[PDB]
Each structure stands twice: as C-alpha cells, then as structure tokens.
Nucleic acid binder design. Structure first.
Lengths: 227, 157, 124, 365, 122
RNA sequence: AUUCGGGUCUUGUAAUUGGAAUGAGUACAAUGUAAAUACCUUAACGAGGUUGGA
C-alpha cells in the first residue's frame, strides 16, 4: 500500500497490495463511511476509497478532467444531491472551511442524505425543487462551483437558472448531461452538442467536455465558466 | 474518405442487422421512395394527404415502423435504414431467444427450421408484425429450436 | 475508413455563404434540397461569420440575406464571426466533425475530407 | 342459429334451492356437464378427475367414480396426469370425457369405466392446455393452449386436425356452439377472436380501452383493463367476455367494439375491482351467469333486441373462487366449481369463505 | 399500491416482459430482489423491473429510492408470477434487472424513453 | 498516426465438444403435356467437406 497526492487538492491515489490504483479522499469523519466504501489508513491518516462507477466526479477525473474547480474551502451548490454518495466526497475535498449546499427533491432519498449530513458540518441538506431556487434562496449564499447532476429533460435550463441566482461571476459549473433522461429516442452524441449550445447561447465558456463511458453509459460532463 | 467511411458504415450495418451484400441497398432504396413519395407530402390536407396519411402511416408495421407518432415519417430516413433493418426475421428473431446469435439463426431460418406460427419461412428476410407466434413449428423434429428454448425469458426489444 | 459512426436525425448542416448566394440566384430550394439528399429531418444552420459575409454581399445583391437569416438555417453562434467563412466553418467542424457541411468552396471541402466523418454536400 | 329461448323473466331465482358439496380434493379448476341421465365431471390441481350423477335435482351431485393421476405418470404419452389439470369437457355423445392441463397432454377417457382410451400430446414444450370446448352435437374438440395456438381435434378419430394462429398471449378461454366455429380470449392481448374454421378466416375484437380516453369521450354528455379472461357464446352471432376489471361485455360479430358493457359487474373489494372468473351463457337463450370470488353468482338477462343485458338476480350461497359454471335442465340446475385458488395461479388476496367443492342451484319456471 | 411511482399502460408492460425474455436469451439479466439490489448498488443495471403485486409491499420499496441515487431507470409490471415466468423461472419474482440488453437494445431504449415521457422530461 | 504517447487488452491453437446439421438417392401419387404423370409439388426413405505486403 502507498497513498500520495495528485494534481488536485485533497484527492489521492493508492498503490495496492496487488498493484491496483484507486482514487480516494481524506476522511473528514474518520471511522465512518457513507456507502460501502473501503476505509484506508496510511501513515496514521484515514482515506475513503472513491469508486468511479458510483461517483460521476471520480469518473470525470479518471477520464482526464484538466483542472478540478472543487478544492480546499470551496463553496459549492450541489443540485441533485441524492443519497449523498458524490456530495460526501466533495465534503472531504472541501474541508471544514468550505461549504456544500445539497438540493434534492425526492424525500425517499433525502432520508438517507440526512444521515450523511448529520455527521458532516460541511453539508447543508435541502429538500426542495431545483426548478424553484426561490424556495432555498433564503438559506444559501453565492458559490464558486455549481455541480449539477439532476435527472430532468430540461436539466440544462434548470442549471442555468440556478446559475444566475447563485453562481459567482467567473465561477465554474460542472454539468452532467444525462442523454437518456433528456430523450431516450435521440442519439446521446446529438444531445451533448445541443445542450452545450444552450450554455454557450447563455454565457458559459465551455472549458472541457468529458464522456463518462466505462463508468456511466450515455453520460457526458461539461466544465464551463459563467461570465 | 466519406465514400470510404461510408463503405465502413455499410459493413457496420452488415451485422448491425445480419446481411451479406447490399440488401442494405434494398432497404436503402426503400427508405428513399418511402420518404421521397412521402416527403412529397407536401402540401395541405387534400383528402389525399388524408388517404396517403393514415396510409403510409399504416406503415405500422409491427416489428416495423416507429412506435406512436407522425405525420413526419422522414424520421424513418433516419430510422428505417437504421430501423426497418430490424423488424424482419433477418433481425427480430434472434432478439427472441430461439436464435443463439444472428448467424446461429438465419441458418435454421433456411435449413427448414424456424417457422412463423404454421408454415416455415425460409425467405430469410421476411418481415414481422404481431410476432407472438414466431415459434419453431418443426412439424425427429427441429432440434436446434425445440429444446434450446432459453427464449423462455426472451423478454427483449 | 475506421471511423465509428453515431450520427442521428436530425442532421445538422452548416450551409456556407457561397452556397446560399448560389441557391438564391438560381432559385434552388436549399432546405428541401438537403432533406431530399439526407433523407431525414435536417436542422439547417449558418455560422455568424458566414451570414456576416453575406451581409456585405447583401449591400448590392439583395435576396441571399433574407433566406440566409431564415429560421430554416438557425444561427450557429460561433465565437469568431470575423474569420473568413471558410476558416469559421473549419474551426467549428474541427471539434464537431459531427455536422454536415454544404459548401461551394471546393477548397474548404478538400481540407474537411481530411477530418473523418464529415458528410459533404454541394450544388453542381 | 340464433337466440330463441326467452325464459329470463320466468326464472324463480329469489326462491332457488341452493346446496354445496365438499370434495376431498384441492382446487377444482373446471366442471363439465353432460346433457342428452345427466353427468358432471370435475378436475383438480390435485390431479383428480371425478364423475357425478346430477340427474336428481332434489339431491346433491352423486359421486360415481374417480381417477387420480400422479408422479407415476412422468414421461408425454402416458395414460395419466402428472401436472395440474386445468380443464375438462364432456363429449356431446356421452361416450367420452377429455382432460388437459399443465402437462401438455390431452387425455380422453371413456365415461363408462373412467379409463384413458387415448392420449394426444400437444408436442410443444409450452403447449399447456388451458380450455376445452366441444362443438355442440359433434365430436369436434377445440383446445386453447398457452403457446398462443388453438388446436382442433376429431375425437372419434383420436387425431389432431389442425392448428389456429392469431393470439399474442395465452388463450385463456374458448367457447363453441353448434356451428364449426369458436370464440377465444387472449388475456393480455385484450382481444377476443372469432374463428370460422371452414372459411379459414377470423374476426378480431379489441378491448383494453384507456380510461382517460373513455372519460374524455364520456364528457360528451373507470378501471384499467389488463386482461380479458373469460368468454361465452350466446348464439352464432353474439358473445360475452369477462375481464379482470369486472367488465362484462356483450359483443356482436358485426361490431368492432362491444355493443354493451357492464362495468365492475361484481363490485369492488385504493379501489380494486373483482375479476370475472366465470361466465356461462346458456346456448341460444337470453340469460347468462357470471361468477367471481365476491360470494355470489350473478344471473343476467339479455334484451330481446340484443343491445343490452340486465341483472336478473343473485345466487348468494356461492362463496369462494368460482372457477367454472355449467347449466343443465330437465327446471334449471346451475353447477359451479368452487376453489380456494384461481384456476391458473393468479394470486388472490383474502377470498371470503374460501372452500373446495361444487355449488348447486335449482331454479324453477 | 404505494411503492408504485407512476402509471404503466399494459402495452408498455408487455413490451417490458418481452424485453426481459430476449435479454435472457441474448444478454445478461439478474432475477430476484436481492440480486436486483446488488445490480443497482454496483451500477450494472440499465433497466430495473418491479412487480406491482408484491406481498409485503415493503420488500421492493427501497428500489425506487436506490435507482434514483444511481440514476438507473425502473418500470413496473402487474404480475410477479408473469415476470418470473418471463425470467426463465417456474416460480414468481418480485423484481428483476437487465444488465446487458443484447438483442433488445432497441426494445429497451424505447421503454426507457416512454417512461421518461410519462414521468415528465423533454 | 503514434514520431511517443495513448488506448486498453484475449489471442492462438493446422489443441479437445456438440444434432440422428445437410445434402444428394427411394417408393410417392400426383396439380400433371389422361401419355410431360417421376421432370415438376409433395411426401418420405434413406445421406456434410482486389489490390498492395514476405
């Protein structure tokens, strides 16, 4: 075993007993895991294994995400926080300094987000509809990163709307494009092109466009800067 | 070249369905006249647009056509080529369990076996419509299809 | 040619300025012409650079502009309208070898054939 | 060959004599009555075939003889049943009774000795026998099967004549009269199909009407149908179906849609309708009987103009899951097989008064 | 039933059972609630199929919640006996999953897109 | 396209299994040249071996 820093803050790689390499983050709440993930001690510091097949962010990193706008003390608005898988990893990355505002409108699932957010002062859970940022206007502040992973046909438009409410000028947006929940009929690759155009025809500056394959079928993530 | 990468595409469809030739040419031309004559909507609702309407629209089809919409069937020109392809036993008869995998299929389609609810159907490029009857028939008996009925859960598309 | 395909209806077609002029002053229905040859729904578009160039041509040759500013072609908002029509399309299709290009510029076509998976259309 | 029996209004239903006879078997799936001394034949999931004398309307069905199948009979041309018997039909000539079920065999027995005289396999690994119906005054048998086919037979040739194709799901129920034709129902295909055997043609009737659409066209002034489960022919030109949303539909061969619908015919009990699990139109008459698991047998009367039917009455001693209904006459005697389970294994939550045996009702005038 | 999130018309329900059968034959399926669960937890499943007549409802109640976290689409059928008997079993099944569609890709893609429409979307 | 980087990972058995694959002959009457009527359609009986580059 060996753990070492990567190009990105608070994000580490492991050499393993057998010779495999897996992403991990620095455990903000030591001894405690959110999903089933492996906990790993190295030189008396504990790390949480970051499975790429579950977390789209881990996926995007392993597909060569140039520069990750999520780091120490960053303020993120997380649309579609779900059960807390990925958001728990951005909590680890951001540390006590920074803040994550998790919006999620499915009660069945916010149920399990609660447990994650109790243990973690970083994360501020919100049971609300990302289509109405007015309904959480009064709890959140403006942010550096708008991380948007919501299953909705007009997902992009939702994201832009939240952006002009909460995203700082020159802030970054990681937008996950779910081809099959925008339209199962259309070609995933035609969808990626037309959604990016919505960002450009607003004023987002497309930095990088990753295809999440192996890890997520019919998915692409866009990194862009709001002006 | 585009000619080249085309001559790629075709070979892609060459078992994106199962063929071995330019039946891709067949279906192609089809798509043409389908569109073509169709696309020549033009026009209005000329009582003609009418008969032709539910007409070509009654392309549906089963295993064939679209699903539920249109009007605008040029969608087909997209599909058809890339859709009309399936449908027929040439396709939608592997996608039903019996056939172990296209090849291991056309062969029975031919080789007597594989029959559409009574009467075989050697024409190893028929067309399907109301399929639930596309069994083996067989009439010691069609072996490859009669016991390897792993299709007993062939709930596919 | 080893190029993996993933094109889906409706085809996205960038129409250049020359083609637009041409089809206008010879009365060729560009929209229907593309749906005919592509045999599927087409979204017909024109970059801002191409239509700007037309705008200059439009000072003495009225008629291309209106057709070219028609919804049928929908504007593709490029970041560099100032670049000759040719280079504009090239730099837009170089990242999106996805879009089909209809051009009368045999020079632009030649250098697009280089890029795998670029349908090319033109008027004889 | 049309409706000529108008005794609907005459029936003394309110004063019907009701009885029940327990059987030591589990889950009667079908009952078949013979009418020229009258007989009934019952089959069960327990692999038992049983013969009753029912000629004395004053006393309950008299057990005469039985034959039980079992594991001994695993092969499929053995002369015994080894998997659930799903259906039984008595031959119109009095000579034969034929059974069939999940072991993909037709077995024809002599009524004399209750012994197998011929076994005719379907020859398909999915060809479970789901329903039988003799052409009236004939030896021509029709078997609806689970592999979407209807097989025909000549019983005094002990042979298979042909196979009919059309359905896109299991053919749950089949009904026939005197003509060389039959009606079938395809369950989840939500169609009924009229097979004209000699003309080599077939009519197709479609249900499965979207409730939102139905409501939409009703506003011009209910319950989802997922399966059409039962069928009975009233004459050579009309038939009735029963669905798992409680709908009893009257159809004419001339019309594409049902000419009449009684929705949730057996009521409900957020809202769930009682399925129609049994349906028997006495041939060429204006009366038919329906059954569910709601505790009673509903007797209905068809209009003289054949454009509607109406509730004549209820036979309320019929608790349990009615799996099959037959009617014999001398005075009408309704016989119905009652089980704790649905014939085919569809799951039924709380059946009130669940029991195993034969319900009888004698109705005068 | 209450764990059922949306309404599935019988045409779709039949197109689902079909999709599953072809997937037994030509692809890879998982059958049973525990195995379906693991398929979602592992992110392998492309489509999840849940029966409507599960008898304690709560047995499959966790699936809608779980599928949404992992963004895997799910669909309903009306009979558990019918889904199991599709699956190549002679007994009932409460839920199943398609891992690789094989010769049902086209058939599945239409389902995952019809359940989008009758869910909202565009 | 590679120049080095990258991609990642079955691929060979001139290895060992599959059905009583199937073809071709044999009554087979024959829509049938009432003779073509064994050549049809059966039926079966039988029955798998261009280029460029050393």
């Amino acid at each position: 075993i060996t753990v070492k820093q990567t190009n990105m803050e608070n994000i580490y790689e492991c050499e393993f007993n057998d010779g495999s390499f897996r992403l991990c983050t620095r455990n903000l709440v030591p001894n405690f895991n959110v999903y089933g993930e492996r906990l790993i001690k190295y030189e008396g510091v504990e790390y949480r294994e970051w499975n790429a097949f579950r977390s789209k962010l881990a996926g995007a990193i392993l597909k060569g995400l140039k520069t990750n706008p999520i780091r120490k003390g960053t303020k993120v608005l997380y649309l579609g926080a779900a059960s807390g898988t990925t958001i728990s990893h951005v909590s680890d990355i951001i540390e006590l300094n920074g803040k994550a505002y998790g919006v999620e409108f499915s009660p069945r699932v916010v149920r399990e987000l609660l447990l994650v957010a109790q243990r973690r002062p970083n994360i501020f859970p919100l049971l609300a509809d990302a289509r109405f940022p007015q309904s959480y206007k009064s709890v959140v502040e403006n942010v550096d990163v708008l991380y948007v992973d919501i299953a909705q046909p007009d997902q992009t438009d939702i994201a832009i709307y939240n952006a002009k409410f909460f995203l700082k000028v020159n802030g970054d947006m990681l937008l996950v494009i779910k081809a099959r929940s925008i339209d199962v009929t259309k070609d995933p690759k035609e969808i990626y092109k037309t959604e990016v155009e919505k960002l450009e025809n607003s004023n987002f500056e497309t930095i990088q466009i990753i295809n999440l394959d192996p890890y997520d079928k019919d998915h692409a993530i866009v990194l862009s800067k709001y002006k | 070249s585009s000619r080249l990468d085309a001559e790629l595409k075709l070979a892609g469809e060459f078992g994106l369905k199962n063929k071995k030739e330019i039946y891709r040419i067949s279906f192609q031309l089809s798509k043409i006249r389908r569109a073509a004559r169709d696309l020549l909507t033009r026009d209005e609702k000329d009582p003609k647009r009418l008969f032709e309407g539910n007409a070509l629209i009654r392309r549906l089809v089963r295993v064939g056509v679209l699903s539920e919409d249109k009007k605008k069937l040029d969608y087909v020109l997209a599909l058809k080529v890339e859709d009309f392809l399936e449908r027929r036993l040439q396709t939608q008869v592997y996608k039903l369990g019996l056939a172990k995998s296209v090849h291991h299929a056309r062969v029975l389609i031919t080789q007597r076996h594989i029959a559409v609810g009574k009467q075989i159907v050697n024409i190893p490029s028929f067309m399907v419509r109301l399929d639930s009857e596309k069994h083996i028939d067989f009439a010691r008996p069609g072996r490859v299809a009669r016991r390897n009925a792993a299709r007993k859960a062939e709930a596919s598309g | 040619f080893e190029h993996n395909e993933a094109l889906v209806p409706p085809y996205n077609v960038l129409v250049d300025t020359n083609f637009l002029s041409r089809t206008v002053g010879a009365k060729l229905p560009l929209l229907e012409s593309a749906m005919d040859c592509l045999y599927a729904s087409v979204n017909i578009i024109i970059t801002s650079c191409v239509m700007a160039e037309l705008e200059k041509l439009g000072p003495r040759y009225r008629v291309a502009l209106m057709i070219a500013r028609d919804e049928r072609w929908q504007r593709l908002t490029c970041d560099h309208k100032g670049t000759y029509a040719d280079d504009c399309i090239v730099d837009r299709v170089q990242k999106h070898r996805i879009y089909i290009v209809a051009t009368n510029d045999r020079d632009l076509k030649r250098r697009i054939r280089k890029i795998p998976g670029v349908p090319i259309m033109s008027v004889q | 060959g049309r409706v000529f029996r108008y005794f609907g209004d005459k029936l003394l239903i309110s004063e019907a004599k009701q009885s029940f006879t327990r059987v030591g078997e589990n889950n009667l799936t079908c009952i078949s009555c013979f009418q020229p001394r009258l007989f009934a034949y019952t089959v069960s999931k327990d692999l038992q075939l049983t013969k009753y004398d029912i000629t004395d309307f004053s006393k309950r069905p008299k057990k005469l003889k039985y034959a039980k199948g079992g594991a001994k009979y695993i092969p499929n041309t053995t002369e015994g049943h080894y998997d659930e018997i799903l259906t039984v039909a008595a031959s119109p000539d009095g000579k034969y009774v034929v059974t069939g079920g999940r072991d993909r065999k037709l077995i024809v027995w002599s009524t004399e000795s209750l012994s197998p005289v011929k076994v005719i396999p379907t020859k398909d690994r999915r060809g479970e026998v789901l329903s039988l119906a003799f052409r009236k005054n004939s030896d021509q048998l029709y078997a609806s099967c689970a592999d979407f086919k209807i097989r025909t037979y000549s019983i005094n040739q002990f042979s298979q004549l042909e196979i009919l194709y059309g359905h896109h799901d299991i053919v749950e129920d089949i009904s026939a009269l005197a003509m060389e034709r039959c009606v079938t129902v395809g369950a989840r295909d939500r169609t009924a199909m009229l097979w004209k055997i000699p003309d080599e043609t077939r009519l197709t009737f479609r249900g499965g009407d979207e409730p939102q659409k139905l409501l939409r066209r009703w506003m011009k002034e209910f319950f989802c149908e997922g399966s059409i489960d039962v069928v009975s022919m009233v004459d050579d030109f009309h038939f009735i179906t029963g669905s798992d949303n409680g709908n009893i539909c009257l159809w004419s061969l001339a019309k594409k849609k049902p000419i009449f619908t009684e929705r949730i015919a057996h009521g409900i009990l957020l809202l769930q309708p009682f399925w129609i699990t049994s349906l028997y139109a006495i041939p060429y008459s204006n009366v038919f009987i329906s059954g569910s698991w709601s505790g009673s047998l509903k007797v209905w009367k068809i209009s003289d103009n054949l454009r509607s039917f109406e509730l004549l009455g209820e036979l309320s001693g019929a608790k349990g899951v009615v799996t099959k209904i037959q009617v014999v006459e001398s005075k009408f005697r309704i016989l119905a097989s009652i089980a704790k389970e649905h014939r085919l294994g569809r799951w039924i939550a709380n059946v009130s008064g669940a029991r195993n045996g034969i319900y009888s009702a004698v109705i005068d005038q | 039933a209450s764990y059922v999130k949306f309404e599935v018309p019988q045409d779709l329900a039949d197109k689902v059972l079909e999709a599953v059968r072809k997937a037994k034959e030509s692809g890879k399926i998982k059958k049973g609630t525990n195995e379906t669960t693991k398929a979602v937890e592992r992110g392998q499943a492309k489509l999840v199929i849940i029966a409507e007549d599960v008898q304690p409802e709560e047995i499959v109640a966790h699936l809608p919640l779980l599928c949404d976290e992992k963004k895997i689409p799910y669909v309903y059928v009306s009979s558990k006996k019918a889904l199991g008997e599709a699956c190549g079993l002679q007994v009932a099944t409460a839920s199943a999953a398609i891992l690789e569609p094989g010769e049902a890709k086209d058939l599945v893609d239409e389902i995952i897109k019809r359940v989008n429409e009758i869910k909202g979307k565009t």
